[PDB]
Amino acid sequence: GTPCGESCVYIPCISGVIGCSCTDKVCYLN
């Protein structure tokens, strides 16, 4: 729900491993 300030537009989310799921090219923390 809370954007992790990370996006998978060009490269995959690195911080996303903490739970951040890429929603519409932008990783959100549930």
From Swiss-Prot:
PTM per Swiss-Prot/TrEMBL:
This is a cyclic peptide.
Q: Which domain of life is it from?
A: Eukaryota
- Supply one GO BP term: defense response
Residue ranges annotated as transmembrane are none
Indicate the cross-link positions, Cyclopeptide (Gly-Asn). Answer: G1-N30
Per UniProt, the keywords (alphabetical) are: Disulfide bond, Knottin, Plant defense
- Output the SUPFAM superfamilies linked to this UniProt entry: Cyclotides
In Pfam terms, one family for this protein is: Cyclotide
Taken from the UniProt record, the cysteine pairs bridged by disulfide bonds within this chain are C4-C20, C8-C22, C13-C27
Family to which the UniProt record says this protein belongs: Belongs to the cyclotide family. Bracelet subfamily.
Primary role: Probably participates in a plant defense mechanism.
Q: What is known of its domains?
A: The presence of a 'disulfide through disulfide knot' structurally defines this protein as a knottin.
Question: In its UniProt entry, what is this protein called?
Answer: Kalata-B5
Q: Which organism is it from?
A: Oldenlandia affinis
The major lineage groups are: Eukaryota, Viridiplantae, Streptophyta, Embryophyta, Tracheophyta
